[PDB]
Structures are given as structure tokens and as C-alpha cells.
Design an enzyme around this catalytic site. Structure first.
Site, PDB file in Angstrom:
ATOM      1  N   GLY A 162     -69.234   9.072 -11.904  1.00  0.00           N
ATOM      2  CA  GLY A 162     -68.171   9.258 -10.918  1.00  0.00           C
ATOM      3  C   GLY A 162     -68.118  10.668 -10.355  1.00  0.00           C
ATOM      4  O   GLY A 162     -67.619  10.871  -9.248  1.00  0.00           O
ATOM      5  N   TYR A 169     -64.317   1.396  -5.925  1.00  0.00           N
ATOM      6  CA  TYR A 169     -62.935   0.999  -6.235  1.00  0.00           C
ATOM      7  C   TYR A 169     -62.556  -0.226  -5.407  1.00  0.00           C
ATOM      8  O   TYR A 169     -62.423  -0.129  -4.196  1.00  0.00           O
ATOM      9  CB  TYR A 169     -61.922   2.131  -5.942  1.00  0.00           C
ATOM     10  CG  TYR A 169     -62.100   3.369  -6.788  1.00  0.00           C
ATOM     11  CD1 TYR A 169     -63.036   4.342  -6.447  1.00  0.00           C
ATOM     12  CD2 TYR A 169     -61.297   3.596  -7.901  1.00  0.00           C
ATOM     13  CE1 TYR A 169     -63.185   5.499  -7.207  1.00  0.00           C
ATOM     14  CE2 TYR A 169     -61.429   4.760  -8.663  1.00  0.00           C
ATOM     15  CZ  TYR A 169     -62.387   5.698  -8.321  1.00  0.00           C
ATOM     16  OH  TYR A 169     -62.516   6.853  -9.046  1.00  0.00           O
ATOM     17  N   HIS A 180     -53.202  14.044  -8.935  1.00  0.00           N
ATOM     18  CA  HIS A 180     -54.261  14.777  -9.632  1.00  0.00           C
ATOM     19  C   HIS A 180     -55.069  15.634  -8.666  1.00  0.00           C
ATOM     20  O   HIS A 180     -55.043  15.423  -7.455  1.00  0.00           O
ATOM     21  CB  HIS A 180     -55.235  13.773 -10.311  1.00  0.00           C
ATOM     22  CG  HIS A 180     -56.041  12.964  -9.323  1.00  0.00           C
ATOM     23  ND1 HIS A 180     -55.466  11.937  -8.580  1.00  0.00           N
ATOM     24  CD2 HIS A 180     -57.335  13.094  -8.946  1.00  0.00           C
ATOM     25  CE1 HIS A 180     -56.429  11.458  -7.810  1.00  0.00           C
ATOM     26  NE2 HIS A 180     -57.568  12.137  -7.979  1.00  0.00           N
ATOM     27  N   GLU A 182     -59.325  17.033  -8.678  1.00  0.00           N
ATOM     28  CA  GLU A 182     -60.591  16.529  -9.215  1.00  0.00           C
ATOM     29  C   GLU A 182     -60.973  17.230 -10.519  1.00  0.00           C
ATOM     30  O   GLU A 182     -60.400  18.273 -10.844  1.00  0.00           O
ATOM     31  CB  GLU A 182     -61.689  16.713  -8.149  1.00  0.00           C
ATOM     32  CG  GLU A 182     -61.389  15.968  -6.852  1.00  0.00           C
ATOM     33  CD  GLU A 182     -61.242  14.475  -7.068  1.00  0.00           C
ATOM     34  OE1 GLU A 182     -62.231  13.837  -7.497  1.00  0.00           O
ATOM     35  OE2 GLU A 182     -60.110  13.967  -6.919  1.00  0.00           O
ATOM     36  N   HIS A 268     -53.548  15.095  -4.824  1.00  0.00           N
ATOM     37  CA  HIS A 268     -53.425  13.905  -4.002  1.00  0.00           C
ATOM     38  C   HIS A 268     -53.029  12.718  -4.862  1.00  0.00           C
ATOM     39  O   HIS A 268     -53.180  12.753  -6.075  1.00  0.00           O
ATOM     40  CB  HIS A 268     -54.721  13.654  -3.188  1.00  0.00           C
ATOM     41  CG  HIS A 268     -55.962  13.595  -4.020  1.00  0.00           C
ATOM     42  ND1 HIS A 268     -56.588  14.748  -4.466  1.00  0.00           N
ATOM     43  CD2 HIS A 268     -56.666  12.517  -4.451  1.00  0.00           C
ATOM     44  CE1 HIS A 268     -57.639  14.337  -5.153  1.00  0.00           C
ATOM     45  NE2 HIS A 268     -57.735  13.006  -5.156  1.00  0.00           N
ATOM     46  N   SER A 280     -66.691   6.640  -3.848  1.00  0.00           N
ATOM     47  CA  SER A 280     -66.325   8.030  -4.050  1.00  0.00           C
ATOM     48  C   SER A 280     -67.257   8.769  -5.003  1.00  0.00           C
ATOM     49  O   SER A 280     -67.910   8.157  -5.851  1.00  0.00           O
ATOM     50  CB  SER A 280     -64.910   8.088  -4.627  1.00  0.00           C
ATOM     51  OG  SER A 280     -64.446   9.428  -4.643  1.00  0.00           O
TER      52      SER A 280
HETATM   53  N1  LIG Z   1     -61.201  12.506  -9.856  1.00  0.00           N
HETATM   54  C1  LIG Z   1     -60.621  11.346  -9.527  1.00  0.00           C
HETATM   55  N2  LIG Z   1     -60.211  11.041  -8.313  1.00  0.00           N
HETATM   56  C2  LIG Z   1     -59.666   9.749  -8.295  1.00  0.00           C
HETATM   57  C3  LIG Z   1     -59.202   9.178  -7.022  1.00  0.00           C
HETATM   58  C4  LIG Z   1     -59.084   7.796  -6.869  1.00  0.00           C
HETATM   59  C5  LIG Z   1     -58.768   7.289  -5.613  1.00  0.00           C
HETATM   60  C6  LIG Z   1     -58.655   5.816  -5.413  1.00  0.00           C
HETATM   61  O1  LIG Z   1     -58.410   5.067  -6.340  1.00  0.00           O
HETATM   62  O2  LIG Z   1     -58.632   5.426  -4.184  1.00  0.00           O
HETATM   63  C7  LIG Z   1     -58.601   8.182  -4.557  1.00  0.00           C
HETATM   64  C8  LIG Z   1     -58.706   9.536  -4.811  1.00  0.00           C
HETATM   65  N3  LIG Z   1     -58.993  10.050  -6.019  1.00  0.00           N
HETATM   66  C9  LIG Z   1     -59.667   9.117  -9.496  1.00  0.00           C
HETATM   67  S1  LIG Z   1     -60.367  10.098 -10.722  1.00  0.00           S
HETATM   68 ZN   LIG Z   2     -59.217  12.118  -6.574  1.00  0.00          ZN
END
Ligand SMILES: Nc1nc(-c2cc(C(=O)O)ccn2)cs1
Ligand SMILES: [Zn+2]
Ligand SMILES: [Zn+2]
Length: 342
Positions: A162, A169, A180, A182, A268, A280
């Protein structure tokens, strides 16, 4: 960008060919101040011909998103369910129990999300290892962005899933991502392959500490248990709550075919409107180096900064290893790669 509002960019096909250079351009435009930017790709760009051949794709660990709380403050518990295919997920997503409610404007759906967050827990097909890009797509390929983050794999062969590899997703109505930044306060890229929209909230990195302070006051048990509990990705905070406590924030809706870029220390959170699929991964620029050195990690993903400091910061290397590197980050400054656009 004095109000640090989320900016949108429309690169041409020529501007889209160099990923790192375009990130440098949007920073010289002030995009990083919001902590989040939208990038709309050229009309002639397509990462895949069709998405009608992925029904048997396996989601090995889908999560039931249980939400507890009240008064715009919530904790999300992710309950692992048995593995299911994309076809099985889509049928649950579009069913009477889990489909998107009726809405005329975003504010109506947003009100419905915050009112019903704790009810009828949805299933999120999160953290699926994989890519939906065809092998030949050279532009903005989430599988191979060619940024300086690549140094970790180049020097050791180590892969952090990831982080330096893509995640898929598969969302459904009311699936969420908690507040959170990153891992290692890195940049992130998120592409919405298809389906219903994904809404985002962002807190400018220059106000990031304000959100952390608010989170510590509301969850003091968590703050005493972990140096950076927001990294557990379990905390949901409504925009009404951020407004009440004077936390500056902005909101944006990402539609299918659009990219979202998150910037170092850009907090975010957000939610899915209905059945969709996003891809992502994390990436870096020279500006990230300082964020990675100063990042506060979970004390309950750590990248060795040595290789980066030795390669891009040899002049400040000796001072850092001794613990005398008293560098203070200016969140308004663009990455040094942006100099050519300034
Ligand atoms: N570093 C991380 N970033 C995420 C994360 C997930 C989403 C999503 O589920 O649409 C969007 C933005 N960041 C999860 S763990
Ligand atoms: Zn994120
Ligand atoms: Zn922790």
C-alpha cells in the site's frame, strides 16, 4: 492560495507525461497549502479499456465498519469478514439495505452520512493488493510513479504493501476513511476508477497541530496510550465539530476518472457515496525528506531516512545523526523541484 482552499488542475496530455514535474508545478501554484488537490486527467487518457472483467476478483479481507459515538465524535471499529468476490460485494452494495439514499445536492447526502454513520454498518473492500491499470499505461501509473520514494526498494528490495505498492478500495454507501496523515507523513495519490463519488475533508498542514490538539482533548485515554493514535485510523470527526472548535478545513467530491493528491502532513478523512473502486499508493518529493525525519509514529510503518539524508541532505547529515538538526518546516514553501516554475 491565502485561504488554503483545495485547488483543481487540468493538465494537457504533454503536461501529464512527467508525474514528478507536474507535482512540482501544482506546488508552485500553492496547491500543497490545502493538504489536498484534485487533478483532472486529459480526455485522451484511459488507464483501462473496460471494468467488466473483474467480477471474480477476490477481496480477501472485507471489513464491516462499526461506528460508535455521538455529538460528531466517533470511533470506527473494522470487523474482518470472510473473503468475497467483486460480484458478491457489488450485490450487497446495490441491495435495499445498503444502497445510496435519495439526494438532490451534496449537503443533503452529507447530512444523511453524519446522521446515520452509527447505523446499518456497511462493508468496505479495503486494502486489496492490486492494480486496475493495463501494463502499457505509462502516465500517472500508480504501480510505477518513479519518484524518490523508489530508493527504499532500489537499495534493499523491501516492499511495504500500500505504501510503495498499490491498494484497491471497493467502496459502498457510508464506507469511510478516518482522520489521518500518510505513513511517514508521505504524499499520496488516489484514482477513482469507476462508480459513485468519494467525498473528502482536509485540514491544511499549517493547521494540522490544531486538529491533533482537539483529538487529544476528546480522547485523553488514547493520547496517553499512543504518541500518534490518529495513525490507528479509527477517529471520525464531523465538519460541524471542526467548525465549532475553529479548525480550518475544506471539502471536495472526487468523481470517477479523477485523481486526488494528498500532501505531507495533510490530514484527510471522507466517505463513499455508493458502489465504487479507488486505487492508491504513497510517493515522495525532496520536500518530504524533512517531514519523514520529523514524523511522529504510532508508539503502540517506519522507513529508514538514512538513505534519503545521505543522498539529498549530506550537508545537514552530521547535524541530524548527532541530534542537533533544529530545522523547522515551513508548510507554505513549495518543493525545491518547483524552482523552474518560479
Ligand atoms: N495511508 C492511508 N491512507 C488511507 C486512505 C484511504 C482512503 C479511502 O479509503 O478512500 C482515502 C485516503 N486515504 C488509508 S491508509
Ligand atoms: Zn490517506
Ligand atoms: Zn499507536
Amino acid at each position: 492560495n491565502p485561504s488554503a482552499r483545495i485547488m483543481t488542475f487540468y493538465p494537457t496530455m504533454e503536461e501529464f507525461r512527467n508525474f514528478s514535474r507536474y507535482i512540482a508545478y501544482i506546488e508552485s501554484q500553492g496547491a500543497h497549502r490545502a493538504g489536498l488537490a484534485k487533478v483532472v486527467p486529459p480526455k485522451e487518457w484511459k488507464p483501462r479499456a473496460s471494468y467488466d472483467d473483474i467480477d471474480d476478483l477476490v477481496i480477501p479481507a472485507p471489513i464491516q465498519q462499526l461506528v460508535t459515538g455521538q455529538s460528531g465524535l466517533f470511533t470506527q471499529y473494522n470487523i474482518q469478514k470472510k473473503a468475497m468476490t467483486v460480484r458478491e460485494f457489488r450485490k450487497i452494495a446495490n441491495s435495499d439495505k445498503y444502497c445510496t439514499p435519495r439526494y438532490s445536492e451534496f449537503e443533503e447526502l452529507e447530512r444523511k452520512y453524519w446522521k446515520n454513520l452509527t447505523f446499518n454498518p456497511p462493508i468496505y473492500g479495503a486494502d486489496v493488493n492490486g492494480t486496475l491499470y493495463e501494463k502499457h499505461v505509462d502516465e500517472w501509473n500508480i504501480g510505477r510513479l518513479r519518484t524518490i520514494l523508489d530508493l527504499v526498494e532500489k537499495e534493499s528490495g523491501i516492499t511495504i504493501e500500500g505504501v510503495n505498492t498499490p491498494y484497491l478500495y471497493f467502496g459502498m454507501w457510508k464506507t469511510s476513511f478516518a482522520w489521518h496523515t500518510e505513513d511517514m507523513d508521505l504524499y499520496s495519490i488516489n484514482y477513482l476508477h469507476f462508480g459513485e463519488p468519494k467525498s473528502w475533508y482536509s485540514v491544511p498542514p499549517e493547521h494540522g497541530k490544531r486538529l491533533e490538539r482537539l483529538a487529544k482533548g476528546f480522547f485523553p485515554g488514547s493520547a496517553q496510550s499512543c504518541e500518534a493514535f490518529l495513525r490507528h485510523k479509527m477517529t471520525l470527526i464531523s465538519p460541524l465539530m471542526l467548525k465549532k472548535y475553529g479548525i480550518p478545513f475544506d471539502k471536495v467530491t472526487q468523481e470517477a476518472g479523477e485523481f486526488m493528491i494528498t500532501f505531507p502532513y495533510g490530514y484527510h478523512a471522507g466517505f463513499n457515496h455508493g458502489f465504487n473502486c479507488a486505487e492508491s499508493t504513497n510517493f515522495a518529493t525532496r520536500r518530504w525528506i524533512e517531514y519523514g525525519k520529523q514524523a511522529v509514529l504510532c508508539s503502540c510503518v517506519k522507513i529508514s531516512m538514512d538513505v534519503f539524508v545521505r543522498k539529498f541532505q549530506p550537508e545537514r547529515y552530521k547535524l541530524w545523526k548527532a541530534g542537533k538538526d533544529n530545522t523547522v518546516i515551513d508548510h507554505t514553501l513549495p518543493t525545491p523541484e518547483a524552482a523552474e516554475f518560479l
